[PDB]
Every structure is written in C-alpha cells, then in structure tokens.
Design a protein around this ligand. Structure first.
Ligand SMILES: [Zn+2]
Ligand SMILES: [Zn+2]
Ligand SMILES: [Zn+2]
Ligand SMILES: [Zn+2]
Ligand SMILES: [Zn+2]
Ligand SMILES: [Zn+2]
Ligand SMILES: [Zn+2]
Ligand SMILES: [Zn+2]
Ligand SMILES: [Zn+2]
Lengths: 208, 208, 208, 208
C-alpha cells in the first residue's frame, strides 16, 4: 500500500536528517544532505504515486531542502556552498516534477521554498567578486526560469513571483555594482538587463 | 480561505515587529524592518487577494512602514538611513501596486504615509552637504512621481498633494542653499527648478 | 524601391520608440535607445541612398536622438548619462556622415539637435566635481569639432554656431569654477582656455 | 526537379529545428543546431543549383543560423558558446560560398545575419578576461574579413558595413580596457589597432 511506504520513507528521512545534523563537520553536513536529497528523489521514483502520498512526499522534500538551506547558511566557502545549492536546486526541481502537484497547499509550500532559496542564494553570493557574481546570478536566473516552468498553476501568481524575484536580483546586482568604477557599470548592467529581459520575454511567451 | 490567511499574516507581522523592536541595536532594527517589509511583500504575493483582504493588507503594510520610519528617526548615520528609506519606500510602492486600492480609507492612509515619508526624508537629509543633498532630493522627487503614478484615484487630490510636496521640497532646498555663497545658488537652483518643472509637466500630461 | 524601405524603417523605428518609452526602468530606456540608435545606423547603411530617402533618414535619426536626450534628462546617475550621451553623439555623427546632407532644412534640424545636445550635456554635467567636469568638457569640445567637420555647408553659420557654443561652455565652466578657492582658477582656467583656443585655431585653419 | 528538392529540404529543416528547440538541455540544443547546420551544408552540396532554388537555400540557412544565435544567447559557458559560434560562422561562410548570390534581397539578408552575429559575439565575449577577449576578437576580425571576401556585391556597402563593424569592435575593446590599469592600455590598444589597420588595408587593396 502506497500510504505505508510514504510514512516509512518519511520516518527514514527524519532519522537520516537527525543523524546528519549531529555531525560536527559543516562540509560533511552539506554533502550528506545533498546525497540524502538525491536518494529521496530516487525513493519517490520507486514509490507508487497517487493522491494521498503526494503531499507526504512534497512535505518531506520541503523539510530536506529547508534543512540543507539552513545548514549551508552556517559555514563554508561561499563558492562551494553556491555550487552545492545549485545542484540541490536542480534535484529539487526534478523531484517536484516527478511528484506533480494537485493541491494549493503544496504549491504554496514550493513557492515559499523557492523564495527562501532565492534570498539565501543572493545573501551568500553577496561576498564574491564581480565575475563569479555575474556567473552565479545568471545560473540562478536560468534555474528560476526552469522552476517556474516546472510547477503548474494559475498564471497570475506565476507572473507576480517572477517579477518580484527578478527585481530582488536586480536590486542586489545594482547594490554590488555601486562599489566599482563607472566603466564596469555599463558593461555588467547591460549584460544583466539583457538577460533579464530575455528570460521575461520567454516566460511571457510561454504562459500566453 | 483568504480571510483567515490575512489574519494569520497580520498576527505574524505583529509579533515580528514586537520582537524586532526589543532589539537594542538601532542599525539591526532598521535592517530587520526592511527585511520584514520585503518578506511581507512576498507574503501578499502568495496570499489570495479579494475585497475583504485588501484593507487588512493595507493596514499591515502601513504599520510596518510607520514603525520603520519611527525607528529610522531615532538613530544612525543620515546617508545610510536615507538609502534604506529609499529602498523600503520602493518596496512600499511595489506592495501597494500588488495589493490594489478600492476603498477611500486605504487611499487616505496611503497618502498620509507618503506625507510622513516625505517630511521624515527632508528632515533627515537636512544635515548632509550639497552634492548628497541634491542627489537624495532628486531620487526623492522621482520616487514621488512613481508613487503618484502607482495609486489611482480622483485627480484633484492627486494634484494638490503633489504640488504641496514639491513646495515642501523647494522650501527645504532654498533654506539649505541660503548658507552658501551666491555662486552655488545659480547652479543648484537651476538644477532643482528644472527637475521639478519636468516632473510636474510629466504628471500633468499623465492625468489629462 | 528605396522609398518604401525608408517608410518601413520609419514605421519600425516609431513602434520601437513607443515600446521603449513604455518601460518603467529609466536605465533600461537609456540603454535600449542607444541600441536603437546603433541599429538605425546599421539599417541606414544597408538602405539604398538617394535624394528622397535622405530627408526621411534625417528625420528618423533626429526623433530617436531627441527621445534619447529627453529620456536621459529624466533620471539616472549623471556620469553614466553623460557617457551614454557621448557614445550616442558619436553614433549620431557617424549616421549623419553616411546619410549625406543636401537640403537646408535637414541642416537646420541637425544644428538644432546639436544645440539641444550641448545644452543638455552642460546642464547634466553641472553637478560633477572638477576632474570629471574637466574631462567631460574636453570630450564635449572634441566631439563638437568632429561634428562641425562632419556636416558640410556655408561657413558663416559654421563659425557663428561654433563661437556661440564655445562661449556657452566657457560661461558654464567659469560659473562652476567660481565655487572654489583662487588657486584652482589659474590651473583649470588656463587648461580650458588653451584647449578652446587650439580647437578654434584648428577650425579656422580648416574652413579657410 | 531541383525545386521540389528545395521544398523537401526546407520542410525537413523546419521539422528538425522544431524537434531540437523542444529539448530542455541548452548545450544539447546548441550542438544539434551546429550539426544541423553542417548537414544542411552537405545537403545543398548535393542539391542542384540554379536560379529558383538559390533564394530558398539562402532563407533556410538564415533561419538555421538565426535559431542557433538565439539559442546560444540563452545559456551556457561564454567561451564554449563563442567557440561554437566561430565554427558555425565558418560553416555559414562555406554554405554561402557554395550557394552563390545573385538577387539583392539575399544579399541584404546575409548582411543582416552578419550584423546580428557580430553584435551577439561582442555581447557574449564582453564577460571574458583580457587574454581570451583579445583572442576571440582577433578571430572575429579575421572571420569578418573572410565573410566580406565571400559574398560578392557593390563595393560601397562592402566598405560602409566593414567600417561600422570594425568601429563597433574598437568601441567594445576600449570599453573593456577602461577597467584595467594604464600599462595594459598601451600594449593591448597597440595590438588591436595594428590588427584592424592591417585588415582594413588588405580589404582596401582587394576591392580596388
Ligand atoms: Zn542519484
Ligand atoms: Zn544556522
Ligand atoms: Zn525579497
Ligand atoms: Zn523615536
Ligand atoms: Zn508639509
Ligand atoms: Zn552596431
Ligand atoms: Zn522629461
Ligand atoms: Zn560535415
Ligand atoms: Zn532567448
């Protein structure tokens, strides 16, 4: 019966998270959390999927991702943390795709997780230099587009959240750029604005 | 149901403001209030929006902005406070645009908040020197134009309030300018008068 | 047929300007207008060139440049706006060179655009410090020389307009310099006077 | 009959483009587009060449290259996309040489595609470091020379477009160099100016 499998997977994930959080090494915590996320994805892949189990899997994946975000916020080199965050976010999108969403509560949970991820990524990536900043920001924008193409729902919130998150990214980029001479402003502002306009156009063509 | 979500968001914001206010550090209070404003915006973004929730969201945003203005008025460096005020007020326009306005009470509350913001900004920016003074006054005028383009309503009040606020800004600018030799008067008076004339022309073309 | 191509280019530019002006972000407006100028230059390059098309190309370029000047006058950091104005003016000179100039009406339109550019540049550059002021003023004088060498016509107007514009620049420079102690007067006044005398001598040798 | 072969090749290419654009992975999209371009070249190689088929082949090659440019603009490591762009542009030149050019419309289409390629390449290569920037710019200039030697036509447009593109490259190079200390300016400005002067001299000797 699928429901019992969902409960046993939930308990297994809870014990695994409790074990991993106990470890003193922060980098070890991050790596084991990423591996746990991948194993959770493979576990959902095997479990039968239906109405009742779907919210259970959604919640368990949300707990894993939130725990990983909190752990990656504690310590570590910023670049390694950002790369692990990107890989984990790709796995998160894949898990959300295979699970599928029906109820509104799961949609709101995923949207909250996305907002938390965006804020955490911006906060961590604040400390880098210019080139890595631009690279990670472009990767974040692309993954944002992929996630908004992954979760189906009403288009109004789909538009509002995308606009708000792109505005957050632009504000952070401008804030960072104001620390550099006038010449770099032109180049990097042009690059970021063109990328944002392109992704906005792609999304607006999609939802129509 | 949207209403219960509105109430619960209100309560969360109330204890959030209460907690943050007990913090001893001033700069921490300002920064966390700005974070709370942004998170509130993202919260309304997800909250289903209809007739009854609209006033509740307007009230909670008004309380957050008023608390931030009072906290900013207490202590801190002038320029940093002004920049945080500008960012938070831009977020305020974004939140008001997302919410939408129907009733007159919400409109009057928004106009009162705008008046409070303008007076506080002028009072704080009084202490700076002419270059930063002129800069902050210019983006203050631009953000005034954006806000008055954001909230729809009757045009007579939208004209009278704009004229009064521009008069306040001009009086403050003249008061500050009267401390320096005659040469600066010409240049800076010309700059400010041209800017205010241009924004007035833009608004008067808009509402017609 | 060249005439139909000129008309379709005109129409494309009009909707391009209409779309661009709609955007809320000021910096995006400025950058996209600069790209529109460059693409207009490239389009004119391919367009077959003859009598009737010349006025049409002169108009469309004039409208694009005027819209960019008005947009730049609205908002933005002074230095970035000035630099974008410089590159746009270089593109404008190149476009005027490739188009060719026969009729008097197009000449008067080009001279009016040059006067507008000079006044706007002076007004915007008023707010900078001495070093940036000197740099931007010297670049402005050099591009003025290039433009007056780009558009052929009767030499009396080419002399009178050059003298008037140089006088405007000198008056603005003196007005700005009167804010600072006596020592800076000697240095920067000497630099600007020598530059102006040199460019005047070059032009007067040229037209003879 | 050659005409039916041209239509069937057109339909095959449209179906292939539609299939490739569907793929989620961006790098796969780029690679399959490049392979499609090469296979298209081999297809025209076998296709009998005459008057009516020539415009059809020009159009289909233009669509393939435009789709590849748009896909390359979406995502990927900049250096990889630049190298793929260089290889695809070489293939594009070879295809244009094999097809031949008689009508003016095909010439204008090819020139527009060249302009799009130059702008996209400059925009993408903006983000690299100094040495890679210089290398890719030199390869771009060389391929520009080859393309302008590939498509025959009137020499006036051949001159104007070359001058405009070289000016674009020089402006971008100066803009990037303005981010670095004074010593690097000398060396790299010298290298780029000598290269562009040499290629201009070669072209001017050619067309005479
Ligand atoms: Zn795996
Ligand atoms: Zn922590
Ligand atoms: Zn936010
Ligand atoms: Zn107080
Ligand atoms: Zn007042
Ligand atoms: Zn160009
Ligand atoms: Zn204006
Ligand atoms: Zn092959
Ligand atoms: Zn795209």
């Amino acid at each position: 019966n699928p429901l019992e499998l969902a409960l046993e997977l939930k308990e297994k994930v809870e014990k695994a998270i409790k074990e991993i959080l106990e470890n003193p090494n922060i980098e070890t915590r991050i790596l084991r959390l990423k591996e746990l996320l991948d194993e959770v994805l493979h576990a959902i892949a095997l479990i039968p999927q239906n109405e009742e189990t779907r919210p259970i899997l959604v919640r368990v994946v949300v707990e894993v991702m939130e725990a990983l975000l909190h752990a990656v916020l504690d310590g570590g080199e910023p670049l390694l943390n950002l790369k692990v965050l990107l890989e984990a976010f790709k796995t998160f999108i894949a898990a959300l795709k295979t699970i599928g969403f029906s109820t509104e509560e799961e949609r709101l949970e995923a949207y909250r997780v996305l907002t938390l991820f965006v804020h955490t990524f911006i906060f961590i990536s604040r400390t880098l230099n210019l080139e890595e900043f631009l690279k990670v920001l472009l990767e974040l924008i692309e993954l944002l587009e992929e996630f908004f193409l992954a979760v189906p729902g009403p288009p109004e919130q789909r538009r509002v959240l995308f606009e708000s998150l792109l505005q957050d990214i632009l504000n952070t980029f401008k804030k960072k750029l104001k620390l550099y001479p006038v010449e770099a402003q032109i180049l990097y502002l042009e690059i970021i604005l063109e990328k944002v306009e392109d992704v906005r156009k792609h999304f607006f063509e999609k939802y129509f």
